[PDB]
Design a protein around this ligand. Structure first.
Ligand SMILES: CCCCCCCCCCCCCCCCCC(=O)OC[C@H](COP(=O)([O-])OCC(O)COP(=O)([O-])OC[C@@H](COC(=O)CCCCCCCCCCCCCCCCC)OC(=O)CCCCCCCCCCCCCCCCC)OC(=O)CCCCCCCCCCCCCCCCC
Ligand SMILES: CCCCCCCCCCCCCCCCCC(=O)OC[C@H](COP(=O)([O-])OCC[N+](C)(C)C)OC(=O)CCCCCCCCCCCCCCCCC
Ligand SMILES: CCCCCCCCCCCCCCCCCC(=O)OC[C@H](COP(=O)(O)OCCN)OC(=O)CCCCCCCCCCCCCCCCC
Ligand SMILES: NC(=O)C1=CN([C@@H]2O[C@H](COP(=O)(O)OP(=O)(O)OC[C@H]3O[C@@H](n4cnc5c(N)ncnc54)[C@H](OP(=O)(O)O)[C@@H]3O)[C@@H](O)[C@H]2O)C=CC1
Ligand code: SF4
Ligand code: SF4
Ligand code: SF4
Ligand SMILES: [Zn+2]
Lengths: 206, 145, 156, 380, 95, 38, 94, 45, 114, 295, 176
């Protein structure tokens, strides 16, 4: 079928088998395992298990996920633990990828994974900067992307797109100053969602 | 030797621009004394030349008019002086000049091209094109309290 | 009179020198810097106009703001502007520098570099082509040609 | 230990601790080009967010578009048609040439070898013309889209790409004559910024930052996309893990890119260039102006956009600078819920302090260059 | 169809013009108010009504795929003409 | 090792919001009405 | 292309290459800037029958993830080990 | 009529070079040293 | 209601960190005024430090206090290492901001906001 | 109020203050602060200028797009004045020169030009007029600068009775010719006033309906002996401790005019010289007990 | 498949060692580098003589915007707002009302050219070919305000450039 993405059952079965393998070996930490219809494996864990689970996947002979592809956060305000912490890992030995997910809120530290991957250093600084998730035992946790003295965590869903302050050069004080934001043209919010359901397969129970 | 054949070509550019005065005029106006074939001339006085033996990019050029829309352009030439019909040909968006493929005539098309007017009294000034949205109540012109 | 005539010729001389030797300091902030590089590249060769490829800020006559100016960067840009010896001109190049562009509604972006420094020429585009930038530099030259510093000096 | 508040793509603030000539500490301060791209994307439809990817590694525009398109196509469960896939490989490799020219010649220009920049940037200008002829723009084409490409090649383009490609390896040869055997160039690059294979993996490196140190990894080979499994090419591998080997890898990759381009020109197939599914890809204008279904779908695709089934994907490609990926989260609507951009230069620059150990100040310029850093993608 | 106001300012095709006490017209002092003088309402009115022999006619604005989406215009009423909603051309059923 | 906290969860001081846009705002929590046109 | 025979010899000798065969300036070998109109083909879904969208609706074949374990025998690797690359036969060494 | 889209010429395009081509040049170390010493000896004489 | 602590296990431990941070800030102001060549006085800088601490005096959650101290230490580091420029230090003082009126009548005259 | 000049917004750059101000002399020391404060709150500023446009560039960033408008003018051309004021609700005259030139003497700059602006403004219907005079303005002064100020102050009041007239002492500030003047030196009591205080008073005088028809005197909080002031300046500048007319003015004791309102009557609190002296004199340091005030 | 870029053993015979000594002492590889820059001196440069010559462009080029008309002079734009909806930068602002003759037309059509990313999405979205990006790229201005285009400016651009815009559309519309 020319327009439809072909399925890959063989990879789906392999990744499912490995997902059970991980769950059996680390029952203390694994809460959910799932494989998407495009064959990506996700391990959902208790936050206490960040270091043991990541170490296992890096070092175990049947895993060897030696490369941390990416580390990021997602803000979901409706959840009690609004922040989802996503680790994307790559195994060159087995030419495979795995995603490890955990959660935290605004006041609960997550264990820094710099001991497992040195790559994690800056990714965790960015998560702290943009989302305000604190990582315990980080060698140097501080803002990385925002301005010095910037207040707030911009990537949170309740942070306004245009922020609270804006900058200009003021001649009286002969320096750049920060003042409350005023826009000559307000950003125009669009309501795009169709009132008609698009995907029956994902309908939620009433 | 070819050195002689090169020097002869140098001397033919002098006669190809109409003697020394014409050769010097293009040298100082355009910094280029190449001789090409005259493709045509627009109503403003710009002249368009081609030489297909030059490499792509140098094979078409315009010698701008010395006066356009009441401005002295002997020294102050501008890329915005090229009218649209020749703009297409000069930038190689097409192979055929407006002398062979004239543009389609329309009643509303500008008959007089204008160059960049920024910095002059003719410059564009923005403004809101919509009318007033709320009408205020006008009190009566007579007294009654 | 001759006194007015002498002033008119001297203004032409200093204007000719200043527009014939425009040394730019390029703030290569983002993608617009790439098109600035293509203007120095062989096809357009800005050096042939007297515009040297890269001057030091203390030997510069024109600042080209070529990219997005973030809030974190704004103080540094103003500091370099204040260190430029006069006469000094600013060319704002690209939508980002002009008015914020694609990132106009961002929390971290200055909505136009003209909030930080005075701007002489605005070059539109995202990015402007190398040729469009060259058109803008030539437009700045014509602006300098119109200056009458000495004429106004002697009518003071 | 002396401290410098700034030493040596964009703008970087490097805070360095020196002891005589030797660099003891290298603390990059980035964010000078952070423009909140990832947040802005949440307010856009999937189509509206596509141009943001041109402006990340704004030397590798169409490769960035490809990564985003592949991610959306995966979530949509559709596939681009074969001709679009070949066009995407063809321009991905043209884009690799664009990037590698910039990477190598500005690396040379930074340490004084200024002339190859000019020779090769006339070749860049000619490839800018290929971009402009397919898309109308020289850089930010917005040409590769989810479902295929925006327009078919204009007649005559493939001939000119062939003409450019036929002569290009000679231009590389002239670049190599200036640098490859030059003792000054070797003095500036050999045994500079050595990274071991294990450290490179654990620091999150990718691309030439891996292969320079001997690791046999290239996503075009191991995790192939659109049609990379149908073209033949070699992966260049280093042996010393230093700047000079990474320079050689990039130069050889340019040669292999031409080799791929030659195959794409010959094996380019006929057909449509975007998915024949008008709930994803807009219909042709002639259909939009005659058929009711086409007009509705055009109207809806350009106002609401297509809905993407809920889900999350990490999709990556072998971009010219290394592994470029997006972690894209769909909530079922026509706007992405979250879009994290994995930029290879982010991890690479994070490793500058490690790589600069035991080197002199002038070596920091060489190491930054060897990493090929564009702050459009580092800062996003 | 450019008309001017008592103050002298040209009136645009959308009817815009600053009133007498409006400070905002200071922006035009020493410069000019850009006004397009090819009023589309006056230009379309000059087009003749097209006589046709059917109750229904189709318009695509001319030029095939270069015009507008093709629409069908009913011409059953004899009081008025059928007007294309896209391009403003008018039609009339003859006899 | 966990600790015991009985304070009502309040993060106003660590979110960075200007004081004006906490105290003087009124949030409206609701399910949107169906658009009557569809 | 306008170089004299002597000057062509001088630069060919200095560079060591036959520069004239591969000039970096384009001349008449480039394609014409006016081309005949195209006539592009249509895709596989351009049919008048046997073409119901529900048989080619990729988006609606997407499914939620398969939950293999929820908190509510031989060892395996995530995939088979990667195969050793083979040294190129085009040119194994530079 | 017929579909007309940008396609490769029938039979494909000609071969494209891509391999490194740094040709060998000059004399050997022995000959170069000989010419240099020969110049010195003539100069000294 | 059993939670993972950040640094402090209770308010008494948390308030020790607060006092330590205040001492560090208090001693840093004179250097900051000189290093950044500020036109404010050392007393003004210390009065501003006290004002910033005082507005958070109502917090009783040790985890919130820990984050405030964590963020306060980051801000102090940015100042001591001169990662901030003069503009950043002076942003605490809102010099170019006009006095916002507070009483009901003043707000009524200017606009609609409360 | 015409609908276009009803205030809107929160008093910032993109707001609408409702002020349409023509500022003559906008390119000088005091002009740049007046324009800045006007542009801070979203006023429409018309800047008539005699100088090259290059010299007005520092004023462009002080307003949102469209809020600063520049026009050519000539002090001796009443049509150029009419063009500049006929749309404004307030006209501010800051034209002055601390010296005479071949083309403009103190009479032209402080009498004829201010009177012509006042007359044309009155004819054009401008409702508010603000004229800066001088605290020491006096027909019987030894300085012809201060004599011309007195005559001009009289003419402006006669020509535009509702004009607000403001009389500052010598103004200190970054670009002043007071502290900078002393720092460049290689009986009399002064009461100098800070530039920002004078600017704030002018802005408030525009917003205060009581300011119409009044004459104000803007002075600093303390009086100093000139010798003690110069001694203080040299100490702050870390320096080991011109025209005939300028020297006369510097040696003129600042007048005491309790019968006039001052900065306090407009809501401005006078800034002491001690809090701003280093701001001005720091640039004079090659890399402090305050002056004794008259009690 | 892979290759080694830098994995070779130098020959340690006397002839080879003496070859490398001669290179070290006589700077042969440096002299060879001088040869290449010498050959470029005698090549024709690639510079074009702007503004008398221009870089080549294609009909698809995305430049300055313009609003187009029908042959009768009627505006093509019918205020559908598809362009405004698609604009990635929110650069377009539109108001509309029934015209005095009942036609569906705009009263405001603004493009902030300093928000615009010149992406061309508006001209793809337009159902009537009303808004286009034209061929002009030489419209830099001395002020920010001059780049805030209202409808009158955009209609004037269309009347100014229509000759070239129509020809360019004629060359590319079969690829659209
Ligand atoms: C050493 C300098 C030698 C002087 C002779 C140069 C010459 O005539 O060659 C032109 C001729 C053309 O060269 P080309 O690269 O093939 O040009 C391509 C086209 O033919 C180009 O030709 P075309 O098809 O474009 O024909 C049109 C063109 C043709 O151009 C010409 O008419 C030739 C003008 C050259 C005249 C130069 C006079 C030299 C006076 C010597 C004193 C000045 C130097 C000190 O006409 C012009 O544009 C004339 C413009 C005038 C330019 C200014 C020339 C005067 C400069 C001296 C001013 C002194 C006062 O070259 C030769 O035939 C070779 C003979 C010259 C020996 C070259 C040896 C190179 C050095 C050896 C290597 C060592 C490197 C260290
Ligand atoms: C020592 C004194 C030397 C004085 C050199 C005078 C330079 C002459 C000159 O201006 O060049 C010609 C120039 C040429 O004019 P141009 O600078 O406008 O050049 C136009 C041609 N293009 C488009 C290629 C730039 O003459 C002038 O510009 C007129 C002003 C004369 C300035 C000198 C007056 C005294
Ligand atoms: C019979 C009895 C006779 C006895 C006497 C016999 C003597 C003859 C035999 C000896 C020959 C002596 C050669 C003298 C030249 C200097 C040689 C030299 O120093 O070269 C080595 C130097 C560094 O070499 P390097 O690769 O870095 O490695 C060495 C460190 N391990 O490498 C360098 O210096 C490189 C130079 C760097 C500068 C590059 C820029 C210049 C390149 C262009 C130069 C053109 C030639 C100059 C001609 C000038 C003419 C006036
Ligand atoms: N500064 C002080 O200490 C005090 C000043 N004042 C008064 O306050 C006002 C401003 O002071 P200040 O700003 O310091 O004066 P400045 O000299 O700093 O600025 C003078 C202004 O007047 C303009 N101007 C001068 N002469 C002419 C002229 N002949 N034609 C047109 N415009 C002219 C200048 O324009 P250009 O730049 O184009 O010449 C400039 O904008 C003056 O009236 C001054 O007397 C009163 C008391 C104290
Ligand atoms: S204006 Fe466009 S090209 Fe220039 S920096 Fe901004 S996004 Fe990049
Ligand atoms: S070109 Fe793109 S950014 Fe510009 S107006 Fe059109 S859709 Fe908006
Ligand atoms: S320009 Fe086209 S897309 Fe935009 S409102 Fe007008 S008709 Fe609709
Ligand atoms: Zn019609």
């Amino acid at each position: 079928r020319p327009t439809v993405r072909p399925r890959n059952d063989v990879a789906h079965k392999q990744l499912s088998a490995f997902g059970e393998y991980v769950a059996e070996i680390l029952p203390k930490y694994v809460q959910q395992v799932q494989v998407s219809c495009f064959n990506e494996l996700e391990i959902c864990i208790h936050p206490d298990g960040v270091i043991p689970v990541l170490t296992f996947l890096r070092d175990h002979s049947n895993a060897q996920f030696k490369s941390l592809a990416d580390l990021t956060a997602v803000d979901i305000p409706t959840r009690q633990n609004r922040f989802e912490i996503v680790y994307n890992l790559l195994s060159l030995r087995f030419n495979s990828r795995i995603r490890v997910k955990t959660y935290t809120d605004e006041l609960t530290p997550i264990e820094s994974s710099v001991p497992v991957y040195k790559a994690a250093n800056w990714y965790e600084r960015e998560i702290w900067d943009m989302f305000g998730v604190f990582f315990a035992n980080h060698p140097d946790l501080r803002r990385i992307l925002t301005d010095y003295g910037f207040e707030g965590h911009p990537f949170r869903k309740d942070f306004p797109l245009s922020g609270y302050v804006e900058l200009r050069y003021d001649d009286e004080v002969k320096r750049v100053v920060a003042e409350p934001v005023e826009l000559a043209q307000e950003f125009r919010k669009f309501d795009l969602n169709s009132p008609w359901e698009a995907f029956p397969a994902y309908r939620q129970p009433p | 030797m070819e050195l002689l054949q090169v020097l002869k070509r140098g001397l033919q550019q002098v006669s190809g621009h109409g003697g020394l005065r014409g050769y010097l005029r293009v040298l100082f106006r355009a910094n280029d004394v190449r001789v090409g074939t005259l493709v045509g001339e627009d109503k403003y006085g710009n002249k368009y030349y081609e030489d297909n033996k030059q490499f792509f990019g140098r094979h078409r050029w315009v010698i701008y008019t010395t006066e356009m829309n009441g401005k002295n352009t002997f020294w102050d030439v501008d890329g915005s002086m090229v009218p649209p019909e020749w703009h297409r040909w000069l930038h190689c968006m097409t192979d055929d000049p407006p002398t062979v493929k004239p543009p389609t005539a329309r009643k509303f098309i500008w008959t007089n091209h204008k160059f960049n007017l920024s910095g002059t009294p003719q410059q564009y000034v923005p403004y809101s094109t919509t009318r007033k949205k709320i009408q205020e109540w006008v009190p009566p012109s007579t007294p009654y309290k | 009179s001759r006194g007015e005539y002498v002033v008119a010729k001297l203004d032409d001389l200093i204007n000719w020198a200043r527009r014939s030797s425009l040394w730019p300091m390029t703030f290569g902030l983002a993608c617009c810097a790439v098109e600035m590089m293509h203007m120095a590249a062989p096809r357009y060769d800005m050096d042939r106009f007297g515009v040297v490829f890269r001057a030091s800020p203390r030997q510069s006559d024109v600042m080209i703001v070529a990219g997005t100016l973030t809030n974190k960067m704004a103080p540094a840009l103003r500091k370099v502007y204040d260190q430029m010896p006069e006469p000094r001109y600013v060319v704002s190049m690209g939508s980002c520098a002009n008015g914020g562009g694609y990132y106009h509604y961002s929390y971290s972006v200055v909505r136009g570099c003209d909030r930080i420094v005075p701007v002489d020429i605005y070059v539109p585009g995202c990015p402007p082509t190398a040729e469009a930038l060259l058109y803008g530099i030539l437009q700045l030259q014509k602006k300098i040609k119109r200056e009458k510093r000495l004429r106004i000096w002697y009518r003071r | 230990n002396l401290t410098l508040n700034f030493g040596p793509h964009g703008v970087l603030r490097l805070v360095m601790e020196l002891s005589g000539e030797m660099v003891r500490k290298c603390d990059p301060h980035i964010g000078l080009l952070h423009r909140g791209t990832e947040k802005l994307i949440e307010y856009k439809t999937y189509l509206q967010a596509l141009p943001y990817f041109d402006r990340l590694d704004y030397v590798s525009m169409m490769c960035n578009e490809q990564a985003y398109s592949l991610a959306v196509e995966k979530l949509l469960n559709i596939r681009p048609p074969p001709r679009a896939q070949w066009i995407r490989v063809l321009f991905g490799e043209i884009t690799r040439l664009l990037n590698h020219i910039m990477a190598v010649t500005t690396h040379a220009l930074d340490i004084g070898a200024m002339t190859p920049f000019f020779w090769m940037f006339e070749e860049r200008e000619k490839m800018f013309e290929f971009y402009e002829r397919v898309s109308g723009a020289r850089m930010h084409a917005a040409y590769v889209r989810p479902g295929g490409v925006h327009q078919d090649l204009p007649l005559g383009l493939m001939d000119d790409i062939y003409e450019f490609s036929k002569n290009f390896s000679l231009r590389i040869d002239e670049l190599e004559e200036m640098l490859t055997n030059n003792r000054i160039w070797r003095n500036r690059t050999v045994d500079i910024g050595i990274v071991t294979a294990e450290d490179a993996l654990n620091y999150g490196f990718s691309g030439v930052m891996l292969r320079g140190s001997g690791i046999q990894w290239d996503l075009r080979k191991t995790q192939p996309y659109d049609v990379y499994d149908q073209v033949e090419f070699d992966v260049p591998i280093g042996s010393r893990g230093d700047c000079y080997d990474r320079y050689l890898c990039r130069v050889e990759e340019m040669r292999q890119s031409i080799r791929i381009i030659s195959q794409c020109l010959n094996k380019m197939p006929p057909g449509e260039i975007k998915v024949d599914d008008a709930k994803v890809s807009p219909p042709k204008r002639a259909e939009m102006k005659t058929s009711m279904e086409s007009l509705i779908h055009h109207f809806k695709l350009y106002t609401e956009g297509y809905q993407v089934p809920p889900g999350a994907t990490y999709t990556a490609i072998e971009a010219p600078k290394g592994e470029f990926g997006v972690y894209l989260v769909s909530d079922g609507s026509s706007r992405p819920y979250r879009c994290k951009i994995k930029a290879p230069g982010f991890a690479h620059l994070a490793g500058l302090d490690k790589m600069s150990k035991g080197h002199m100040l002038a070596d920091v310029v060489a190491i930054i260059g060897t990493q090929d850093i564009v702050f459009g993608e580092v800062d996003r | 169809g450019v008309r001017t106001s008592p103050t002298g300012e040209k009136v645009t095709h959308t009817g815009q013009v600053y009133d007498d006490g409006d400070y905002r017209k200071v922006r035009f002092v020493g410069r000019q108010k850009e006004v397009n003088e090819n009023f589309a309402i006056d230009l379309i009115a000059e087009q003749p009504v097209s006589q046709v022999g059917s109750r229904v006619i189709s318009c695509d604005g001319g030029g095939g795929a270069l015009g507008h989406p093709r629409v069908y215009i009913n011409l059953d009423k004899e009081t008025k003409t059928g007007t294309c909603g896209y391009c403003g051309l008018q039609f009339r059923q003859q006899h | 090792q966990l600790i015991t906290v009985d304070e009502k969860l309040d993060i106003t001081t660590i979110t960075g919001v200007p004081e004006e846009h906490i105290k003087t705002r009124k949030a409206r929590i609701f399910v949107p009405a169906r658009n009557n046109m569809q | 292309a306008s170089a004299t025979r002597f000057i062509q010899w001088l630069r060919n000798w200095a560079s060591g290459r036959d520069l004239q065969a591969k000039l970096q300036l384009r001349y008449q070998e480039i394609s014409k800037r006016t081309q005949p109109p195209p006539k592009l083909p249509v895709g596989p879904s351009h049919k008048l029958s046997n073409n119901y969208y529900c048989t080619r609706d990729g988006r609606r074949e997407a499914m939620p993830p398969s939950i293999v374990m929820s908190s509510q025998k031989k060892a395996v690797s995530p995939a088979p080990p990667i195969k050793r690359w083979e040294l190129s036969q085009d040119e194994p060494y530079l | 009529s017929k579909v007309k889209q940008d396609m490769p010429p029938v039979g494909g395009y000609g071969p494209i070079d891509y391999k490194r081509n740094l040709p060998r040049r000059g004399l050997s170390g022995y000959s170069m040293f000989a010419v240099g010493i020969g110049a010195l000896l003539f100069g000294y004489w | 209601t059993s939670v993972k602590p950040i640094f402090s296990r209770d308010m008494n431990e948390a308030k020790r960190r607060v006092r330590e941070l205040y001492r560090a800030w208090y001693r840093e102001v004179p250097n900051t005024v000189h290093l950044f060549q500020l036109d404010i006085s050392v007393k003004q800088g210390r009065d501003k430090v006290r004002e910033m601490f005082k507005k958070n005096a109502h917090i009783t959650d040790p985890r919130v206090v820990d984050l405030l101290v964590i963020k306060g230490k980051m801000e102090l580091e940015e100042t001591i290492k001169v990662w901030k420029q003069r503009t950043h230090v002076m942003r605490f003082f809102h010099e170019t901001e006009a006095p916002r009126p507070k009483d009901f009548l003043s707000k009524f005259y200017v606009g609609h906001d409360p | 109020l015409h609908h276009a000049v009803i205030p809107h917004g929160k008093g910032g750059r993109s707001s609408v203050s409702g002020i349409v101000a023509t500022v003559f002399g906008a390119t000088g020391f005091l002009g740049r602060y007046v324009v800045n404060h006007l542009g801070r709150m979203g006023s429409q500023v018309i800047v008539p200028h005699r100088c090259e446009p290059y010299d007005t560039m520092h004023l462009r960033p002080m307003g949102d797009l469209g809020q600063i408008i520049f026009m050519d003018w000539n002090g001796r051309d009443k049509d150029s004045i009419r063009r500049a004021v006929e749309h404004s609700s307030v006209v501010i005259n800051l034209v002055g020169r601390e010296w005479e030139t071949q083309n403009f003497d103190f009479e032209d700059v402080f009498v004829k030009i201010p009177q012509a602006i006042a007359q044309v403004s009155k004819e054009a219907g401008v409702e508010k007029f603000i004229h800066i005079s001088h605290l020491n303005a006096d027909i019987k002064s030894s300085s012809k600068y201060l004599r011309s100020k007195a005559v001009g102050e009289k003419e402006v009041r006669e020509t535009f009775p509702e004009a607000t007239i403001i009389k500052p002492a010598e103004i200190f500030g970054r670009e002043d010719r007071f502290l900078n003047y002393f720092a460049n030196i290689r009986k009399t009591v002064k009461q100098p006033v800070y530039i920002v205080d004078v600017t704030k008073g002018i802005i408030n005088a525009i917003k205060d309906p009581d300011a119409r028809g009044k004459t104000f005197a803007f002075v600093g909080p303390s009086r100093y002996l000139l010798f003690d002031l110069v001694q203080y300046v040299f100490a702050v500048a870390h320096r080991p401790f011109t025209t005939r007319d300028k020297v006369e003015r510097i040696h003129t004791t600042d007048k005491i005019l309790p019968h006039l309102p001052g900065l306090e009557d407009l809501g401005v609190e006078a800034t002491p010289l001690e809090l701003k002296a280093i701001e001005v004199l720091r640039r004079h340091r090659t890399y402090v007990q305050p002056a004794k005030t008259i009690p | 498949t892979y290759k080694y870029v830098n994995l070779r053993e130098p020959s340690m015979d006397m002839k080879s060692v003496t070859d490398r000594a001669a290179q070290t002492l006589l700077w042969t590889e440096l002299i060879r580098g001088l040869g290449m820059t010498l050959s470029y001196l005698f090549r024709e440069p690639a510079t074009i003589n702007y503004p008398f010559e221009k870089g080549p462009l294609s009909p698809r080029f995305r430049g300055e915007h313009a609003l187009r008309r029908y042959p009768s002079g009627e505006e093509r734009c019918i205020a559908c707002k598809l362009c405004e909806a698609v604009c990635p930068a929110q650069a377009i602002t539109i108001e509309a009302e029934p015209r005095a003759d009942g036609s569906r037309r705009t009263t405001r059509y603004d493009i902030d050219m300093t928000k615009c990313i010149y992406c061309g999405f508006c001209q793809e979205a337009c159902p009537v070919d009303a808004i286009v990006e034209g061929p002009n790229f030489e419209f830099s201005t001395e002020t920010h305000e001059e780049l805030l285009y209202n409808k009158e400016k955009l209609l004037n651009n269309g009347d100014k450039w229509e000759a070239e815009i129509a020809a360019n559309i004629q060359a590319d519309y079969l690829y659209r």
